[PDB]
Design an enzyme around this catalytic site. Structure first.
Site, mmCIF file in Angstrom:
data_model
loop_
_atom_site.group_PDB
_atom_site.id
_atom_site.type_symbol
_atom_site.label_atom_id
_atom_site.label_comp_id
_atom_site.label_asym_id
_atom_site.label_seq_id
_atom_site.Cartn_x
_atom_site.Cartn_y
_atom_site.Cartn_z
ATOM 1 N N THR A 132 38.215 26.886 -25.807
ATOM 2 C CA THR A 132 38.696 26.386 -26.878
ATOM 3 C C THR A 132 38.124 24.946 -27.484
ATOM 4 O OG1 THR A 132 40.835 27.381 -26.740
ATOM 5 C CG2 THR A 132 40.760 25.569 -28.317
ATOM 6 N N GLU A 189 5.064 0.948 -5.989
ATOM 7 C CA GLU A 189 5.713 0.296 -7.034
ATOM 8 C C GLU A 189 5.129 1.021 -8.411
ATOM 9 O OE1 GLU A 189 4.328 -1.679 -4.314
ATOM 10 O OE2 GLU A 189 2.874 -0.650 -4.761
ATOM 11 N N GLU A 245 -9.349 7.401 -8.423
ATOM 12 C CA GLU A 245 -8.020 7.897 -8.886
ATOM 13 C C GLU A 245 -8.207 8.171 -10.327
ATOM 14 O OE1 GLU A 245 -5.741 8.612 -7.205
ATOM 15 O OE2 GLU A 245 -5.876 7.384 -5.359
ATOM 16 N N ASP A 281 35.523 19.779 -24.390
ATOM 17 C CA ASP A 281 35.852 18.937 -25.515
ATOM 18 C C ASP A 281 36.870 18.021 -25.222
ATOM 19 O OD1 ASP A 281 37.256 21.329 -25.908
ATOM 20 O OD2 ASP A 281 37.696 20.752 -27.754
ATOM 21 N N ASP A 308 39.375 18.497 -20.053
ATOM 22 C CA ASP A 308 38.230 18.755 -19.498
ATOM 23 C C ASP A 308 37.576 17.485 -18.731
ATOM 24 O OD1 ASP A 308 37.920 21.313 -20.155
ATOM 25 O OD2 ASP A 308 37.447 20.685 -22.249
ATOM 26 N N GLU A 313 -4.802 3.641 0.162
ATOM 27 C CA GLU A 313 -4.663 2.410 0.599
ATOM 28 C C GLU A 313 -3.969 2.380 1.683
ATOM 29 O OE1 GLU A 313 -2.008 1.270 -2.467
ATOM 30 O OE2 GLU A 313 -3.227 1.768 -4.114
ATOM 31 N N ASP A 345 34.735 25.296 -20.819
ATOM 32 C CA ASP A 345 35.956 25.073 -21.381
ATOM 33 C C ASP A 345 35.860 26.052 -22.612
ATOM 34 O OD1 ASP A 345 38.525 24.119 -22.761
ATOM 35 O OD2 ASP A 345 36.956 23.495 -24.160
ATOM 36 N N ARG A 387 44.825 29.602 -18.357
ATOM 37 C CA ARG A 387 46.165 28.901 -18.145
ATOM 38 C C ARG A 387 46.080 27.979 -16.993
ATOM 39 N NH1 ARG A 387 51.342 29.877 -20.745
ATOM 40 N NH2 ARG A 387 52.840 29.568 -19.256
ATOM 41 N N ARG A 435 64.291 30.665 -31.870
ATOM 42 C CA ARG A 435 64.102 31.399 -30.546
ATOM 43 C C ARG A 435 64.942 32.715 -30.323
ATOM 44 N NH1 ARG A 435 65.324 28.665 -25.829
ATOM 45 N NH2 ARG A 435 64.316 30.270 -24.750
ATOM 46 N N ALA A 473 0.883 -1.443 0.001
ATOM 47 C CA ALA A 473 0.154 0.046 0.091
ATOM 48 C C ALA A 473 0.954 1.203 -0.004
ATOM 49 C CB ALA A 473 -1.091 -0.185 1.125
HETATM 50 N N1 LIG Z 1 56.964 28.984 -37.231
HETATM 51 C C1 LIG Z 1 56.820 30.401 -36.685
HETATM 52 N N2 LIG Z 1 56.868 31.216 -37.635
HETATM 53 C C2 LIG Z 1 57.086 32.586 -37.405
HETATM 54 N N3 LIG Z 1 56.678 32.841 -36.116
HETATM 55 C C3 LIG Z 1 56.529 32.057 -34.996
HETATM 56 C C4 LIG Z 1 56.509 30.683 -35.488
HETATM 57 N N4 LIG Z 1 56.445 30.090 -34.229
HETATM 58 C C5 LIG Z 1 56.351 30.924 -33.274
HETATM 59 N N5 LIG Z 1 56.523 32.191 -33.491
HETATM 60 C C6 LIG Z 1 56.406 33.500 -32.766
HETATM 61 O O1 LIG Z 1 57.404 33.521 -31.622
HETATM 62 C C7 LIG Z 1 56.763 32.933 -30.608
HETATM 63 C C8 LIG Z 1 56.808 31.375 -30.233
HETATM 64 O O2 LIG Z 1 56.158 30.880 -29.065
HETATM 65 P P1 LIG Z 1 56.814 31.209 -27.471
HETATM 66 O O3 LIG Z 1 57.918 30.364 -26.948
HETATM 67 O O4 LIG Z 1 57.739 32.709 -27.508
HETATM 68 O O5 LIG Z 1 55.670 31.272 -26.639
HETATM 69 P P2 LIG Z 1 54.563 32.191 -26.310
HETATM 70 O O6 LIG Z 1 54.004 32.869 -27.369
HETATM 71 O O7 LIG Z 1 55.434 33.868 -25.997
HETATM 72 O O8 LIG Z 1 53.033 31.815 -24.991
HETATM 73 P P3 LIG Z 1 53.219 31.231 -23.743
HETATM 74 O O9 LIG Z 1 52.859 31.914 -22.486
HETATM 75 O O10 LIG Z 1 51.972 29.944 -23.848
HETATM 76 O O11 LIG Z 1 54.496 30.172 -23.258
HETATM 77 C C9 LIG Z 1 55.158 33.886 -30.706
HETATM 78 O O12 LIG Z 1 54.248 33.558 -29.734
HETATM 79 C C10 LIG Z 1 54.915 33.712 -32.333
HETATM 80 O O13 LIG Z 1 54.031 34.397 -32.693
HETATM 81 C C1 LIG Z 2 13.783 -3.262 -7.310
HETATM 82 C C2 LIG Z 2 14.277 -1.544 -7.407
HETATM 83 O O1 LIG Z 2 15.456 -1.402 -7.798
HETATM 84 C C3 LIG Z 2 13.434 -0.572 -7.217
HETATM 85 C C4 LIG Z 2 11.975 -0.795 -7.172
HETATM 86 O O2 LIG Z 2 11.346 -2.189 -7.355
HETATM 87 N N1 LIG Z 2 11.473 -0.050 -6.592
HETATM 88 C C5 LIG Z 2 12.148 1.287 -6.449
HETATM 89 C C6 LIG Z 2 13.442 0.804 -7.300
HETATM 90 O O3 LIG Z 2 14.546 1.307 -7.183
HETATM 91 C C7 LIG Z 2 12.307 1.547 -5.011
HETATM 92 C C8 LIG Z 2 12.655 2.927 -4.555
HETATM 93 C C9 LIG Z 2 13.965 3.417 -4.172
HETATM 94 N N2 LIG Z 2 13.405 4.782 -3.723
HETATM 95 C C10 LIG Z 2 12.128 5.165 -4.278
HETATM 96 C C11 LIG Z 2 11.391 6.352 -4.162
HETATM 97 C C12 LIG Z 2 10.024 6.442 -4.546
HETATM 98 C C13 LIG Z 2 9.385 5.128 -5.087
HETATM 99 C C14 LIG Z 2 10.412 3.793 -5.032
HETATM 100 C C15 LIG Z 2 11.634 3.955 -4.639
HETATM 101 C C16 LIG Z 2 9.979 2.441 -5.546
HETATM 102 C C17 LIG Z 2 10.940 1.371 -4.859
HETATM 103 C C18 LIG Z 2 10.486 0.143 -5.567
HETATM 104 C C19 LIG Z 2 10.518 -1.295 -4.630
HETATM 105 C C20 LIG Z 2 8.881 -0.235 -6.034
HETATM 106 MG MG LIG Z 3 38.572 22.522 -25.403
#
Ligand SMILES: Nc1ncnc2c1ncn2[C@@H]1O[C@H](COP(=O)(O)OP(=O)(O)OP(=O)(O)O)[C@H](O)[C@H]1O
Ligand SMILES: CC(=O)C1=C(O)N2[C@H](C1=O)[C@H]1c3c[nH]c4cccc(c34)C[C@H]1C2(C)C
Ligand SMILES: [Mg+2]
Ligand SMILES: [K+]
Ligand SMILES: [Mg+2]
Length: 994
Positions: free
Chosen positions: A353, A309, A908, A703, A707, A771, A351, A678, A489, A305
């Site tokens: 990028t 269920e 009901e 992504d 993350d 019930e 996130d 960073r 560099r 009751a």
């Molecule tokens: N192949 C490339 N051709 C021309 N320029 C580049 C090339 N690769 C990197 N650079 C330049 O020089 C840098 C390369 O990376 P760097 O080590 O200085 O890190 P950052 O850019 O200062 O940043 P972070 O804080 O993530 O370390 C510049 O950011 C960028 O635009």
């Molecule tokens: C066999 C079994 O896995 C289960 C089910 O068979 N049930 C539910 C359930 O999760 C049970 C339950 C847990 N918490 C709540 C809140 C409200 C209602 C219910 C429940 C239904 C409960 C029961 C035993 C019917």
């Molecule tokens: Mg990302």
């Protein structure tokens, strides 16, 4: 090896006592293997569905029936030599409902895929070592690497362990560290110390981390740590943490489970108290068995009751329909309960990028010189739209469109972008999109060149695969790239040495085409190109140029800026030494300035809009990005997380700044701040934990592998359709098409589900209280059985289930999104509403006793002792000549029950109509509205006849079809229900709150 980044190469060598030139002896390898184990993440199996089923019976409310069934099975067996051919249904229906229900519960949280399996895909099987017993590089299993190993990595290797880089063989080592940062940009490694012991991944420019990959160059290093002690090892430990999670709603339901049972238990002492109230007079003539089973008869009935269920089917169905409408929106819901979660979410962490952004680097602005005259210098500035790698887009000057090939300067700019480039573009015919090949920043240059189309090449008719590099090939035909002065560099730039195609080695007209960091490159210009001419670089020309570079670099532009130049008279190839990169800055001098390009990774187009709708529903949006703070902020501003000029000093942090705050300060910072840049993967889940410790229901969207911990830790993880498998399998929901709008729609769905559940929980528990109230009266008033377990199980699974599921089909409220979210501390049913099902309950309780108790008296069909003497079903034959004058087996009759249960049903049914609106009287919201519910009532009603008419049924449930007069009484006692909720619906709409 702890803190290898903050030491020298020799300190790390000395640390393990190895030479860089020979490696571990194979003795060192043995010892080190024993001491550190093997180099791999441990697998997490994840519970096999035996142990899940078993856990479904781990909560009271089920254990409470699992107990019953047994006692109904104790009773099933010890049945009198009578109804013997199916006394067993009770135990077994019950125990079958257990399994069913428990199956459903496991099934709805499904999911084979395993996020640690996905994450060990970044473990290479092989790595490369030097060890003492051979001179040449050995190619062993990765898992056999130990700390102290000398390892070598090169282009396209997966990094097999966490390694301190010892020497870089090529001119640069470029690393893709997107599993720890979200960003695919190449990181330029080096070998110096990074003394700060608290340096974040992004700062450890002298380390290689396991599971990232080498995008360019060749390096040797020493292994610092392996297995579970690496940066990928941390990500793995946080995805283990499988502390059985429940949604906010599941927990509520459980709270509610726990209360239902601490009902049932108190009612059994109560039913044990009015029983031991009259235990002082058995006239002891029939064994303490006739009373022994008088508890564990009404004690079973008390459970059947009180428990609804059923809830699990209709709840599961509710979720399951939500999940199907979210499929139509291209949101895949991996876990049925999470289709509700976003509905009560208060904070969404996101996130950037690839999530908030497209993660396609785009050239959005460029410029060349227009005109020069003493202190006067103007630029031609242009804008370019498109934010994919697709070559679709236009070039604007003033937001009017132009032909690039009309500016001679744009021609040279496109020329430099196409030649001074190691990447290209590919159309992916399976996925129907363009994709970068090589580095994003370079590919940006490629797509740019294709959008400029500076020579007016015809591309309207090229297949999409041919179109990917049409304009670039044109440029490649004009000029032969002989070799690249690759990037170093010390100069911040790179070049390509080129000869006119169709010239001889000795000919004139060789060019170098340079690109790089604006300052170094601008200092190495002595000239600027104007159109097809050239004039001296002067202070005010330079000043002009640097000025807009500066601006472009620091708005909520904040663009990555490259200068493009040309050496008009490069050195004779012969005079250049290629093997010496330190010579390259000199070869890259006497330059002509040509132009600047500005690229960023742009927001998806629906995000801004989505953030504003979250804001309207009272949801906070917070960015957690592995990327740098200046882009983080700039993007926050483009998408409305910060106003275009809000000050954000105390509102934005790096990983490292956050790690400097004390605990109380960090915690507070997650409420005050909206931008976290960073960071490491741990920072994301840590921010989540802090938000959750204010009791906020917190979502995570992203992504990346980086993350995954945060997605796992959030109340719901939402992954993008184009991101990683790892992110996808730590998530409960996936945006297949990457539309962030879907988030807001997911909120709407969430609220709508919560409302359904409220309305059919109220509606069902109502029944449940009636019930319990019959059963406690066909008891404390020693009364013949008014209703039996086999029956309540039918009303409670089916006749109530079809309508309860049918209340489902309501179109949601108009106003559900204009209202902050419900507090975590707001009980399911409460207050008024509880009182209101209570009163329904009792009236059912009193209505069902009656219709039984009145086919025993006033009912021509069974005139019983009409002064309440129906209380004594004790003195049957016991006092046969007492207050009698006719039969004996008249209590076990189906009628008293068929009137009792017919009323529990018709009541009901009306309730199913009350229930269409919590408050708006059936008067004002007509009860024809939801058809499916009336539909449902016919299904239910007819089913109710199947058990009265279809031959075999009326014996199990012990019934008999009723006289026209009979129903018309059932109907006289049920129809009032409506005016009852109604008095509770006037009182609500008015003399309550409104
Ligand atoms: N192949 C490339 N051709 C021309 N320029 C580049 C090339 N690769 C990197 N650079 C330049 O020089 C840098 C390369 O990376 P760097 O080590 O200085 O890190 P950052 O850019 O200062 O940043 P972070 O804080 O993530 O370390 C510049 O950011 C960028 O635009
Ligand atoms: C066999 C079994 O896995 C289960 C089910 O068979 N049930 C539910 C359930 O999760 C049970 C339950 C847990 N918490 C709540 C809140 C409200 C209602 C219910 C429940 C239904 C409960 C029961 C035993 C019917
Ligand atoms: Mg990302
Ligand atoms: K989660
Ligand atoms: Mg269950």
């Amino acid at each position: 090896m702890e803190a290898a980044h903050s030491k020298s190469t020799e300190e790390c060598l000395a640390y393990f006592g190895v030479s860089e030139t020979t490696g571990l002896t194979p003795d060192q390898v043995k010892r080190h293997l024993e001491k550190y184990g093997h180099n791999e993440l441990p697998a997490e199996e994840g519970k096999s569905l035996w142990e899940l089923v078993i856990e479904q019976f781990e909560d009271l409310l089920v254990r409470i029936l699992l107990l019953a069934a047994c006692i109904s099975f104790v009773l099933a067996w010890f049945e009198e030599g009578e109804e013997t051919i199916t006394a067993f249904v009770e135990p077994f229906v019950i125990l079958l409902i257990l399994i069913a229900n428990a199956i459903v519960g496991v099934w709805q949280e499904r999911n084979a895929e395993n996020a640690i399996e996905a994450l060990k895909e970044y473990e290479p099987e092989m790595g490369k070592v030097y060890r003492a017993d051979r001179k040449s590089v050995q190619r062993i299993k990765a898992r056999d690497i130990v700390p102290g190993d000398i390892v070598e990595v090169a282009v396209g290797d997966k990094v097999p362990a966490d390694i301190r880089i010892l020497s870089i063989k090529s001119t640069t080592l470029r690393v893709d560290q997107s599993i720890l940062t979200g960003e695919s940009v190449s990181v330029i490694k080096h070998t110096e110390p990074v003394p700060d012991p608290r340096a974040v991944n992004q700062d450890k420019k002298n380390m290689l981390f396991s599971g990232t990959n080498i995008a360019a160059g060749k390096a040797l290093g020493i292994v610092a740590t392996t297995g579970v002690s690496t940066e990928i090892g941390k990500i793995r430990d946080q995805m283990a943490a499988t502390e059985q999670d429940k949604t906010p709603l599941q927990q509520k339901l459980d709270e509610f489970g726990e209360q239902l049972s601490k009902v049932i238990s108190l009612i059994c002492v109560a039913v044990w108290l009015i029983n031991i109230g009259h235990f002082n007079d058995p006239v002891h003539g029939g064994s303490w068995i006739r009373g022994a089973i008088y508890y564990f008869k009404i004690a079973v009935a008390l459970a059947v009751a009180a428990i609804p269920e059923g809830l699990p089917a209709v709840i599961t169905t509710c979720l399951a329909l939500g999940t199907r409408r979210m499929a139509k929106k291209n949101a895949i819901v991996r876990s049925l309960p999470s289709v509700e979660t976003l509905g009560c979410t208060s904070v969404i962490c996101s996130d950037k990028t690839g999530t908030l952004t497209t993660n396609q680097m785009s050239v959005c602005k460029m410029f060349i010189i227009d005109k020069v005259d003493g202190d006067f210098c103007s630029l031609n500035e242009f804008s370019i739209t498109g934010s994919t790698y697709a070559p679709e887009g236009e070039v604007l000057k003033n937001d009017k469109p132009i032909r690039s090939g009309q500016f001679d300067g744009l021609v040279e700019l496109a020329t430099i972008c196409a030649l001074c480039n190691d990447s290209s573009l590919d159309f992916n015919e399976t996925k129907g999109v363009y994709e970068k090949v090589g580095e994003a920043t370079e590919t940006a240059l490629t797509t740019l060149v294709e959008k400029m189309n500076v020579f007016n090449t015809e591309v309207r008719n090229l297949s999409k695969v041919e179109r990917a590099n049409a304009c670039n090939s044109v440029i490649r035909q004009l000029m032969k790239k002989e070799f690249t002065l690759e990037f170093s560099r010390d100069r911040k730039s790179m070049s390509v040495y080129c000869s006119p195609a169709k010239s001889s080695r000795a000919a004139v007209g060789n060019k170098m085409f340079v690109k790089g960091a604006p300052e170094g490159v601008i200092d190495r210009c002595n000239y600027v190109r104007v159109g097809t001419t050239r004039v001296p670089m002067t202070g005010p020309v330079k000043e002009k140029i640097l000025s807009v570079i500066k601006e472009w670099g620091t708005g909520r532009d904040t663009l990555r800026c490259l200068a493009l130049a040309t050496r008009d008279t490069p050195p004779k190839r012969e005079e250049m030494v290629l093997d010496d990169s330190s010579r390259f800055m000199e070869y890259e001098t006497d330059l002509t300035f040509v132009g600047v390009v500005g690229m960023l990774d742009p927001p998806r187009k629906e995000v801004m809009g989505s953030i504003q709708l979250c804001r309207d529903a009272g949801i906070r949006v917070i960015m957690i990005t592995g990327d740098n703070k200046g882009t983080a902020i700039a993007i926050c501003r483009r998408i409305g997380i910060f106003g275009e000029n809000e000050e954000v000093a105390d509102r934005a942090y790096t990983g490292r700044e956050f790690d400097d705050l004390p605990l109380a300060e960090q915690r507070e910072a997650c409420r005050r701040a909206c931008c976290f840049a960073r960071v490491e993967p741990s920072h994301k889940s840590k921010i989540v934990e802090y938000l959750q410790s204010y009791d906020e229901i917190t979502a995570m969207t992203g992504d990346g592998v980086n993350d995954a911990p945060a997605l796992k830790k959030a109340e719901i993880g939402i992954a993008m359709g184009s991101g990683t498998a790892v992110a996808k399998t730590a998530s409960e929901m996936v945006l297949a098409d990457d539309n962030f709008s879907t988030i807001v729609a997911a909120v709407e769905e969430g609220r709508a589900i919560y409302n359904n559940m409220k309305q059919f929980i109220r509606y069902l528990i109502s029944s449940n209280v009636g019930e319990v109230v019959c059963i406690f009266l066909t008891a404390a008033l020693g009364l013949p059985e008014a209703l039996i377990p086999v029956q309540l199980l039918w009303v409670n699974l089916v006749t109530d289930g079809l309508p309860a599921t049918a209340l489902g089909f309501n179109p949601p409220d108009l106003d559900i999104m204009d209202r902050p979210p419900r507090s975590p501390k707001e009980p399911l049913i409460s207050g008024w509403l509880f009182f209101r099902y209570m009163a329904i309950g009792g009236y059912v309780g009193a209505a069902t006793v009656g219709a039984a108790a009145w086919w025993f008296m006033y009912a021509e069909d069974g005139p019983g002792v009409t002064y309440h003497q129906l209380t004594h079903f004790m003195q049957c034959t016991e006092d046969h000549p007492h207050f009698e004058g006719l039969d004996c087996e008249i209590f076990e009759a189906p009628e008293p029950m068929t009137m009792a249960l017919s009323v529990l049903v018709t009541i009901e049914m009306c309730n199913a109509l009350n229930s269409l609106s919590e408050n708006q009287s059936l008067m004002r919201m007509p009860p024809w509205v939801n058809i499916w519910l009336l539909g449902s009532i016919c299904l239910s009603m007819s089913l109710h006849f199947l058990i009265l008419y279809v031959d075999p049924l009326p014996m199990i449930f012990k019934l008999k079809a009723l006289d026209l007069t009979q129903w018309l009484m059932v109907l006289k006692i049920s129809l009032p229900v409506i005016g009852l909720d109604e008095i509770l619906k006037f009182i609500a709409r008015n003399y309550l709150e409104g």
